[PDB]
Amino acid sequence: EIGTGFPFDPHYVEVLGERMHYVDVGPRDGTPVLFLHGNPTSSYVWRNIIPHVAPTHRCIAPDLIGMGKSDKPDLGYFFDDHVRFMDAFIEALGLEEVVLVIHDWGSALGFHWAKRNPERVKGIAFMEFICPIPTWDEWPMHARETFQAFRTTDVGRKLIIDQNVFIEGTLPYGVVRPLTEVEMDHYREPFLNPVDREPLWRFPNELPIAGEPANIVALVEEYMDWLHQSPVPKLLFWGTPGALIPPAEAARLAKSLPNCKAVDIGPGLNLLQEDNPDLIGSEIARWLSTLEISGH
Ligand SMILES: [Cl-]
């Protein structure tokens, strides 16, 4: 009873001269809800969540540049490249105020956008998000060893670029329930050609771990300090054991962040959307019905 289909018409918009693919469903009668995926997923990750929200709120879910059905410009696919394209995507759709629903690298994009444009963010739903990781000791050995290997230019590229391990390993390892072959083939579609795998390797190399890279550590601290002082409505989803956000950290954030509701999805690792999309979609729709936005 977790759906494998993608029941949305294709949309594409030109952004900095490149095409970006996106979902866009639901009425243009209020504040749209912008869904931002991370590594190594696409808008496909939101397929079972959006249908709970779309009847009453417009849902917009882009594929990041170099990912999903978006174009593949010859870039390094550093976080700042994703910032440029996601800022331009939001402007190309003429979005004014938004609600954010964000995950993994999509959460870095959304929180960084919110810090720069705080008056335009009416709420943030977030899960398995990017915050500073001051020590490798915070991760279990198996995850520590694999990401330390990923964060090399020789070994890391052989694994992610040549062997496609982020798709063939990290992805199904991040879902507690078994991902099916149909779902794996959806996630594999953008990365059939090894030369298209650059974003999958640059992303782990950008993760703010033990002080490096220092520019990402600084920007992440900046948007976490922003979040910690912001009155914006917040909805945090978490699972057990989690990956980036263990239960103990979710419990801390539930008390430290202003105007925050936390929801336990049950068993989960990084890809919570693949373990309990029904609860995540149901709870986003209930929370949207409490915000001071059109339709309240
Ligand atoms: Cl990553």
Swiss-Prot record:
Residues 32-156 form the AB hydrolase-1 domain. Gene3D superfamilies: alpha/beta hydrolase. It comes from the Bacteria. GO terms for cellular component: membrane. Its EC number is 3.8.1.5. It catalyses: 1-haloalkane + H2O = a halide anion + a primary alcohol + H(+). PANTHER family: CIS-3-ALKYL-4-ALKYLOXETAN-2-ONE DECARBOXYLASE, MONOACYLGLYCEROL LIPASE. NCBIfam families: PRK03592.1. Belongs to the haloalkane dehalogenase family. Type 2 subfamily. Monomer. This is Haloalkane dehalogenase. It comes from Rhodococcus sp.
